[PDB]
Design a protein around this ligand. Structure first.
Ligand code: CLA
Ligand code: CLA
Ligand code: CLA
Ligand code: CLA
Ligand code: CLA
Ligand code: CLA
Ligand code: CLA
Ligand SMILES: CCCCCCCCCCCCCCCC(=O)OC[C@H](COP(=O)(O)OC[C@@H](O)CO)OC(=O)CCCCCCCCCCCCCCC
Ligand SMILES: CC1=C(/C=C/C(C)=C/C=C/C(C)=C/C=C/C=C(C)/C=C/C=C(C)/C=C/C2=C(C)CCCC2(C)C)C(C)(C)CCC1
Ligand SMILES: CC1=C(/C=C/C(C)=C/C=C/C(C)=C/C=C/C=C(C)/C=C/C=C(C)/C=C/C2=C(C)CCCC2(C)C)C(C)(C)CCC1
Ligand SMILES: CC1=C(C/C=C(\C)CCC[C@H](C)CCC[C@H](C)CCCC(C)C)C(=O)c2ccccc2C1=O
Ligand code: SF4
Lengths: 160, 732, 91, 164, 63, 192
């Protein structure tokens, strides 16, 4: 796909694993083998070897630079590069957008609506932050019932 | 009635502002006093003639300097190892190192090397000697003189044309499409066939042997008998050397496609056929509208009849013909929108498909010629949008445009501005977050942790063009598509050989850095469009100030009340979007010059590894290519890039000087000039000298314009210097 | 080949379409669209002497109103189609 | 206040040329190493007397030659200085947004965004406003001083750590 | 005159900040010759910081 | 009655032949658009019912499908074999100029009717068998659009079978389906 070799069989990706441990191994040569800063570089090497063995096992595509490239078209092999964490993101981002929208409706029908935005009512906030879990069923539910959008006759419009 | 005489209200100004604004309101003809329709259109018509005369008197001096002080014949003998000379230098401030260092191209003195691609152009078109360029310079002196005579003539009352002649859009479009775009491209084709193709094939065709040198072995027989393929019978082979008779063909109108293999440039037989095609189709398209003969179209009834019956476009385009025809700013904005989209189509198609001989090999000339048309196009497009704003203030009638598409743009203008705002914010967070993320991963020792996105949509389009590098194999890269089998005998043997080559710039191999900077480009166009659509649609008024139309176009502000109304005008949105076009085209030409400056010396892996993060842009492009730029002059000595080393520093002056007008504002300088006026009025021997203009500070609109123009001059000179010193000193 | 028959038949086909087929389609559209109109008036009515529609050149003796401009319009399409055909055949 | 605002820029200019003269003057004429037989090799040997008289020397032998350790510090311990060098350029170019612009443009852009919020019923009761003109100048000069001072901080603390 | 005191009205004035906004009528002037007698109070201020503005009955509808 | 229980819209009352109320997107909502859509639905269908015998009966008699009998014009020499016999006047500039003359004279004479009902069903010379001047008139118009929409769906089938399976025809798609019908369906096109 797109002229990119897989990273498990890429010679450039294995070259970057070789020259990263060798950079960290030469950093280890000036420390005692049981010393505290040498345990951090030894944990860095095992973090590096975990990283390169994770990138090759996920079917990542590596170019001529030896670097893993993401295919965001919507490929059946490449769902976890953009499509799977994008749907994970939009669920979380729609959770932020739904509990901030539902908080403003809950404080617009209050005695002092502007004091509830500088001082956020946490019992009112936390009872709808739980309610933002099921938000695609509540956003399209408000879209189908007409409560999501406001009619243009009740919207402040600058003159022509 | 002092200067300025066109505005009575500025003539009674007793300050220096009268001197300033009369320069800047000089061509705003419709804002003048005692000013009418006929004088508007006739002064604009004679100003067009003066503009044509300036363009032709410019080309005449760019031809005269090549013919006189340039080695055009020596460049014609060897276009690969001779630098093209623009003009000689006579500077009284040179020392002997500067005279000895600016002497290039085998000249007798200090000369300037031409990076405008006029030698490549005049070579491809047929001009060979200095006498031909001199004759062209005299001919265009005569043409500019004729346009000055015609400009003076149409201001005489015998030859003054009325506004009904000026607003005749149908006759203007018929004679523009038929004459300007059709008979000039057919005239061209007659040149390219009569002169440029035989001068590419060694035959010297001039005016003395125009009627004797037959362009084809059987000329004008197979044309009128229908067998046009005789004109595509014997094309130029791949062993053809340009300008020589050996290896050449006899066909004048081929359809080969691709590039000439020695020049890496387009075939003159293809460009001749290209012009015969954009000549037949423009003369045929110029018989469209109704002028004098019963047949044709009335564009008023075309726009009236183009209403969707569901009411989604309202009244459609009803009332738009009078809206364009009465508003000169609508026509000028449409012309500049089309001109920006084609000056950018010029820039995109003369680097990838070089049209002139030995232009692809001359690298810094190609870099200049891309940056030229991308900056001239980012000022022409912003002028289009600014003229849309001036149309909405001083030319848009809401009564005449009642519920049409143009009124409905004002009806949903907050949706357009807010969705351009969302798209700009999306592109900005995503492009900045991915570049900053890739910066952090190269900083943290882990290049593999970058989010690198292969631009598979544009790579799929390149494989749809015929690039077999990515292996998509859909159409024109696979032999099983009907488009390939319809093209593989017709143009694709040239095109696939041109696009599968990796040394040229035809549809380059793109990567994750190309993806990221294309989102930078989309950020730049989207945010410039955001500010400009916001200026054009909030031109008449807004929720902060509903009477912006009654304050004119370029008014400074509306006062500190209602929170503060700084930069509220539509001119100020144009002002803020000149910075955004400068940033946009800076990103575009940074990407062009670094994608090409790594292509030309071979190591495209430097761009493929370093363009994904901004420290590669700072270090491997802005710092690495500036090695021989700022070493153009040293304490030890000075090189031939020294003028480009001064012009770089000069840009850093003028740009930063703009900050003085863009940060510091008026009343500080007004009290400063008040103290200066006291000091001059009380100093002995200097109090005797008076001013007639009262010294004032620069006014607020003038301050934004002066800072913007300084910002733009510094921005174009810092990059013209860096770009013409980091490619011409390290060729490759 | 056969330039004298291909051009003549293709011009005669488009002139047959211009006189008997598309002449009610063309005469209706030149009356529905009419003359070009600026600001509610004709270009000649607004003051342009060069925008006057010629009537001596348009004075036709054809009973269906088929004039010499329509000869120069429909016959031009018959040569555009006729040289489209001749270029396609000779290949 | 606006004179304090402009004097903050002139303090940037004054103090930045002071510390630039300091850094180049002692990297060229003071700081260095002493080998055997009393020979002193400075960091940038003797180029202050000949290159710090031109702006091209200041751009070249100071702002380009000594910035060859803040931009290739990536992949090392001094790479946070490269990150804050670039982010300091970001904060400076972010300052130029607030300094060059004015309130009324941003107020009408916020009016369009408030319209998009009114369309989806997510209008806050605390009305979104553009920053004040004094506040816009304050934000611009704060990012200008922060970005430029952090640029000089990152360049200084990468260069003189690298060659020290 | 006026719709009602203490009633909810919507402003039809194009150049006001509270166009298509819900406002509460606090005073209507019954003196003849007054162009804008209906005083409407709004929950949100404008850019000048005020919420009190005078409108004609032709620029308001009951909502 | 394209959906039982669905409320038919106000612009579709049922008095039209074939008025089953099928308009979810509301394209015929405009009254003057809806009068053009009724004379467009019938010319399309009548061309489609002249096309289904023009596809299957050349295929069932063995002279190829409607694609391989159409590729001769792109070839410089195809000779225009009709019923296994090459016609002498079967050249591409000859048969296109007749089609751009004879059909264009037929379609211009069709568009000249001012009555919006004689544009739909003209009668007279186009009804020589006299079935329009008979006892049944409403059900034959319902027979027109029910047969017509079936052939309109058939020609859509005909076209997208050639895109999905090039080189094969609709009876050859029928013969491919009649052998092993549980393996070779539209799912071969949906799931590659
Ligand atoms: C309460 C939640 C809420 C909701 C549901 C939205 C939703 C909307 N806003 Mg946003 N916005 C909000 C908070 C909110 N915003 C706040 C707090 C700010 C100040 C930073 C803005 C500033 C703003 C701008 C500048 C823009 C939008 C726009 C948009 C639209 C697209 C989303 C977008 O551009 O990315 C979100 C944009 C941001 C700048 C991120 C702010 C989101 C914060 C982090 C959420 C905070 C909520 C929490 C309870 C406090 C959409 C109508 C765009 C528009 O005009 O509509 C098309 C647009 O131009 N908004
Ligand atoms: C064919 C192209 C074309 C034409 C002739 C027009 C025509 C005009 N423009 Mg326009 N414009 C265009 C393209 C062009 N412009 C482009 C390229 C830009 C982008 C830079 C703009 C940006 C611009 C603005 C936004 C303003 C004009 C205005 C004007 C008027 C001239 C003002 C004057 O004397 O300036 C004289 C200018 C100088 C002396 C400064 C030049 C100094 C250089 C840059 C250094 C006139 C109606 C003004 C107008 O109509 O007022 C309401 C106005 O405010 N134009
Ligand atoms: C056949 C008749 C004829 C022709 C030749 C023209 C010619 C022209 N008219 Mg004119 N006009 C005519 C009749 C004619 N008109 C009629 C009948 C009307 C009456 C309504 C008008 C009324 C009219 C008005 C009122 C105006 C014009 C103007 C102009 C000029 C256009 C501006 C210009 O020069 O840009 C030149 C443009 C081109 C050559 C087209 C190029 C197209 C794109 C942008 C470029 C593509 C070219 C190519 C890629 C570039 C390669 C070259 C590169 C290598 C250097 C041009 C000289 C204007 C003018 O300048 O007045 C002096 C003007 O004010 N005319
Ligand atoms: C406006 C455009 C232009 C003009 C002024 C001319 C002018 C001329 N052409 Mg020419 N030419 C052009 C278009 C042009 N060409 C194009 C479109 C083609 C490509 C098909 C050619 C190819 C062509 C041929 C091959 C020949 C000419 C020749 C001629 C000459 C006489 C034409 C004749 O007898 O009638 C004359 C110098 C003829 C001649 O004798 O030239 C020496 C000749 O046979 N032309
Ligand atoms: C992993 C890192 C990450 C982070 C830090 C960001 C950061 C940001 N993104 Mg982004 N983005 C990411 C992943 C990331 N993105 C991925 C993987 C996707 C692919 C699906 C996108 C696609 C994306 C969308 C589609 C949008 C965001 C938006 C947002 C911004 C505001 C969101 C908010 O507060 O909700 C505010 C409340 C909302 C309702 C907006 C959320 C959009 C809804 C769900 C549709 C925020 C600055 C917005 C943006 O940048 O545009 C202005 C926005 O519109 N991002
Ligand atoms: C590095 C400098 C820089 C940065 C990031 C900003 C920031 C931005 N510009 Mg720009 N701009 C700048 C300099 C810059 N600009 C200068 C020099 C000027 C010239 C005077 C302007 C003038 C200006 C105007 C006139 C407009 C913008 C707009 C905006 C937004 C563009 C949408 C976007 O990218 O959202 C992404 C946001 C970022 C990339 C900022 C990231 C900061 C992170 C979140 C901190 C944590 C955003 C806030 C437009 C806007 O706000 O509408 C949406 C607007 O119309 N800019
Ligand atoms: C509004 C945001 C937006 C805009 C302006 C751009 C702009 C650009 N992208 Mg796109 N694109 C975006 C978001 C966007 N993209 C997102 C969310 C992804 C997934 C990461 C992609 C993935 C993508 C790839 C793979 C490539 C581009 C390319 C391009 C160009 C062609 C248009 C295209 O394919 O868009 C497609 C737009 C979408 C799929 C989403 C639209 C916006 C949604 C609503 C968010 C253009 C420069 C090409 C390029 O960089 O050329 C070298 C290229 O091949 N885009
Ligand atoms: C599935 C069939 C979908 C038909 C839905 C369409 C439908 O709902 O019609 C809605 C609308 C037609 O609106 P008009 O007012 O033009 O037509 C009134 C309709 O009632 C038709 O009579 O069409 C569109 O908006 C065009 C969409 C296609 C856009 C084509 C873009 C062309 C780009 C340039 C090439
Ligand atoms: C405000 C205003 C204005 C202005 C505006 C502007 C300036 C705009 C712009 C806009 C623009 C500037 C746009 C452009 C566009 C373009 C386009 C839209 C294109 C497209 C293309 C196409 C679609 C094509 C196709 C294709 C392809 C793609 C590929 C292949 C080939 C082909 C050809 C097929 C004015 C003046 C009017 C006035 C009023 C107001
Ligand atoms: C029957 C009849 C008649 C007769 C008529 C006739 C005989 C006619 C003819 C007609 C004709 C005889 C016509 C013609 C026309 C022509 C034309 C009008 C042409 C034109 C051309 C063109 C324009 C072309 C173009 C081109 C060129 C030039 C080159 C390039 C290509 C092309 C092809 C495009 C009469 C009256 C007696 C009456 C009775 C009946
Ligand atoms: C951008 C800009 C603005 C607009 C600036 C704004 C609106 C400030 C934005 C502050 C933040 C980003 C919004 C408030 C954030 C809230 C705390 C909500 C949190 C949401 C996320 C940040 C988590 C001006 O008002 C201005 C005025 C005068 C000259 C120049 C300018 C100027 O350049
Ligand atoms: S004079 Fe300057 S500071 Fe005062 S309101 Fe106008 S733009 Fe703002």
């Amino acid at each position: 796909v797109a002229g990119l070799t897989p990273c498990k069989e890429s010679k450039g990706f294995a070259k970057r694993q070789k020259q990263e441990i060798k950079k960290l191994e030469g950093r280890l040569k000036l420390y005692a083998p049981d010393s505290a800063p040498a345990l951090a570089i030894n944990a860095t090497i095992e973090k590096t070897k975990r990283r390169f063995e994770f990138y090759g096992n996920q079917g990542l595509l590596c170019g001529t630079d030896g670097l893993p490239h993401l295919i965001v078209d919507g490929d059946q092999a490449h769902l976890g590069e953009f499509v799977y964490p994008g749907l994970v993101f939009l669920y979380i981002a729609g959770w932020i957008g739904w509990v901030g929208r539902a908080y403003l409706i809950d404080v617009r029908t209050s005695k002092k609506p502007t004091e509830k935005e500088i001082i956020i009512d946490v019992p009112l906030a936390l009872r709808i932050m739980s309610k933002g879990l099921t938000w695609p069923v509540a956003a399209i539910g408000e879209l189908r019932s007409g409560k999501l959008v406001e009619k243009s006759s009740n919207i402040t419009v600058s003159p022509r | 009635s002092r200067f300025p005489k066109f505005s009575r209200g500025l003539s009674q100004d007793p300050t220096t502002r009268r001197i300033w604004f009369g320069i800047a309101t000089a061509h705003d003809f419709e804002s003048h006093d005692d000013m009418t329709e006929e004088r508007l259109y006739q002064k604009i018509f004679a100003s067009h003639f003066g503009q044509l005369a300036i363009i032709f008197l410019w080309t005449s001096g760019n031809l005269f300097h090549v013919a006189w002080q340039g080695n055009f014949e020596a460049w014609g003998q060897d276009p690969l190892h001779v630098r093209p000379i623009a003009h000689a230098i006579w500077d009284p401030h040179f020392g002997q190192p500067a005279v000895e260092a600016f002497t290039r191209g085998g000249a007798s003195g200090p000369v300037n090397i031409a990076y405008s691609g006029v030698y490549q152009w005049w070579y491809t078109i047929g001009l060979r000697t200095n006498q031909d360029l001199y004759g062209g310079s005299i001919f265009l002196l005569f043409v500019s003189a004729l346009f000055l005579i015609a400009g003076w003539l149409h201001l005489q009352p015998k030859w003054k044309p009325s506004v009904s002649w000026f607003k005749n859009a149908e006759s203007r479009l018929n004679h523009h499409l038929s004459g300007l775009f059709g008979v000039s491209s057919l005239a061209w084709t007659g040149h390219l066939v009569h002169v440029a193709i035989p001068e590419s094939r060694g035959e010297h065709v001039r005016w003395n042997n125009l009627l004797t040198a037959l362009p084809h072995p059987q000329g004008l027989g197979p044309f009128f008998a229908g067998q046009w393929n005789v004109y595509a019978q014997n094309p130029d082979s791949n062993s053809h050397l340009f300008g020589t008779s050996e290896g050449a063909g006899t066909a004048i109108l081929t359809f080969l496609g691709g590039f000439h293999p020695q020049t890496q440039s387009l075939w003159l037989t293809d460009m001749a056929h290209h012009h015969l095609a954009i000549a037949v189709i423009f003369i045929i398209a110029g018989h469209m509208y109704r002028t004098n003969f019963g047949i044709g179209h009335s564009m008023k009834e075309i726009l009236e009849a183009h209403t969707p019956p569901g009411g989604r476009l309202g009244r459609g385009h009803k009332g738009l013909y009078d809206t364009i025809n009465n508003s000169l700013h609508f026509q000028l904005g449409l012309a500049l929108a089309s001109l920006g989209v084609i000056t950018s189509l010029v820039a995109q198609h003369m680097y990838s498909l070089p049209p002139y001989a030995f232009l692809a090999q001359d690298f810094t000339t190609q870099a200049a010629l891309y940056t030229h048309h991308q900056y001239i196009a980012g000022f022409i497009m912003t002028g289009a949008f600014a003229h849309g704003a001036i149309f909405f203030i001083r030319d848009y009638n809401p009564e005449q445009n009642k519920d049409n598409v143009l009124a409905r743009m004002l009806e949903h203008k907050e949706a357009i501005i807010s969705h351009l705002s969302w798209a700009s914010l999306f592109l900005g967070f995503h492009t900045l977050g991915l570049y900053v993320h890739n910066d952090v991963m190269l900083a943290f020792g882990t290049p593999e942790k970058q989010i690198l996105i292969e631009p598979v949509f544009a790579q799929w389009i390149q494989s749809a063009h015929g690039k077999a590098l990515y292996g998509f194999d859909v159409l024109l890269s696979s032999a099983d598509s009907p488009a390939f089998n319809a093209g593989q005998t017709l143009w694709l043997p040239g095109w696939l050989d041109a696009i599968n080559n990796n040394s040229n710039s035809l549809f380059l191999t793109i990567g994750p850095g190309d993806f990221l900077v294309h989102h930078a480009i989309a950020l730049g166009l989207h945010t410039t469009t955001l500010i400009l659509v916001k200026g054009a649609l909030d031109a008449r008024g807004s929720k902060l100030m509903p009477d912006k139309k009654e304050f004119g176009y370029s008014f400074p502000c509306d006062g500190p009340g209602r929170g503060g109304t700084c930069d509220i005008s539509a001119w100020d949105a144009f002002y803020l979007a000149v910075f955004w076009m400068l940033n946009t085209i800076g990103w575009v030409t940074f990407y062009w010059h670094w994608k090409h400056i790594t292509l030309w010396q071979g190591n495209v892996a430097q761009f493929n590894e370093s363009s994904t993060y901004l420290m590669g842009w700072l270090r491997d492009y802005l710092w690495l290519n500036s090695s021989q730029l700022i070493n153009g002059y040293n304490p030890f000595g000075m090189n031939s890039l020294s003028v480009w080393a001064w012009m770089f520093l000069f840009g850093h002056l003028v740009w930063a000087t703009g900050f003085m007008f863009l940060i510091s504002w008026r009343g500080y300088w007004q009290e400063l000039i008040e103290t200066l006026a006291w000091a001059h009025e009380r100093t002995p021997l200097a109090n005797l000298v008076r001013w007639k203009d009262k010294p004032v500070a620069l006014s607020i609109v003038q301050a934004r314009l002066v800072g913007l123009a300084h910002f733009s001059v510094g921005y174009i000179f810092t990059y013209a210097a860096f770009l013409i010193a980091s490619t011409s000193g390290k060729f490759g | 080949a056969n330039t004298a028959l291909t051009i003549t038949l293709s011009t005669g086909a488009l002139l047959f379409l211009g006189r008997f087929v598309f002449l009610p389609f063309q005469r209706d559209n030149v009356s529905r669209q009419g003359l070009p109109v600026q600001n509610g008036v004709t270009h000649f009515d607004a003051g342009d002497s060069r925008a006057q529609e010629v009537t001596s050149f348009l004075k036709t003796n054809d009973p269906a109103g088929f004039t010499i401009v329509d000869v120069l319009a429909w016959g031009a399409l018959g040569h555009a189609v006729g040289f489209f055909i001749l270029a396609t055949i000779n290949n | 206040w606006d004179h304090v605002f402009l004097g903050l820029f002139w303090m940037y200019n004054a103090i930045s040329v002071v510390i630039f003269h300091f850094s180049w003057k002692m990297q060229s004429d003071v700081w260095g190493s002493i080998s055997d037989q009393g020979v002193v090799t400075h960091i940038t040997g003797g180029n202050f007397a000949q290159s710090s008289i031109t702006i091209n020397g200041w751009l070249r032998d100071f702002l380009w030659a000594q910035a060859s350790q803040v931009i290739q510090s990536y992949g090392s311990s001094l790479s946070a200085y490269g990150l804050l060098f670039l982010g300091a350029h970001f904060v400076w170019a972010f300052s130029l947004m607030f300094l060059f612009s004015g309130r009324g443009y941003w107020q009408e852009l916020i009016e369009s965004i408030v319209w998009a919020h009114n369309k989806l019923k997510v209008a806050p009761a605390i009305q979104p406003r553009a920053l004040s003109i004094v506040q816009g100048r304050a934000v611009g000069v704060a990012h200008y001083l922060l970005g430029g001072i952090a640029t000089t901080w990152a360049f200084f603390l990468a260069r003189i750590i690298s060659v020290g | 005159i006026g719709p009602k005191r203490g009633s909810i009205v919507k402003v039809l004035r194009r150049e006001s900040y509270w166009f298509n906004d819900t406002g509460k009528v606090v005073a209507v002037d019954q003196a003849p010759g007054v162009r804008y007698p209906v005083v409407v109070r709004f929950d949100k201020v404008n850019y000048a910081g005020v919420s009190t503005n005078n409108y004609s009955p032709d620029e308001l509808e009951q909502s | 009655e394209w959906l039982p229980g669905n409320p038919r819209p106000s612009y579709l009352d049922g008095s039209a032949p074939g008025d089953f109320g099928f308009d979810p997107l509301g394209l015929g909502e405009v009254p003057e658009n809806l009068e053009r859509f009724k004379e467009s639905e019938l010319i399309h269908a009548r061309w489609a019912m002249l096309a289904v015998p023009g596809v299957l009966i050349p295929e069932a008699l063995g002279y190829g499908n409607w694609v391989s009998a159409q590729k001769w014009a792109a070839t410089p020499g195809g000779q225009a074999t009709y019923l296994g016999n090459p016609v002498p006047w079967g050249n591409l500039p000859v048969i296109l100029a007749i089609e751009f003359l004879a059909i264009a004279f037929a379609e211009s004479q069709r568009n000249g009717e001012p009555d919006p009902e004689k544009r739909k069903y003209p009668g007279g010379a186009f009804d020589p068998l006299g079935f329009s001047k008979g006892a049944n008139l409403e059900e034959l118009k319902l027979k027109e659009i029910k047969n017509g929409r079936l052939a309109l769906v058939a020609f859509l089938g005909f076209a997208v079978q050639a895109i999905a399976y090039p080189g094969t025809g609709p009876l050859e798609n029928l013969k491919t389906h009649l052998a092993d019908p549980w393996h070779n369906t539209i799912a071969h096109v949906i799931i590659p």
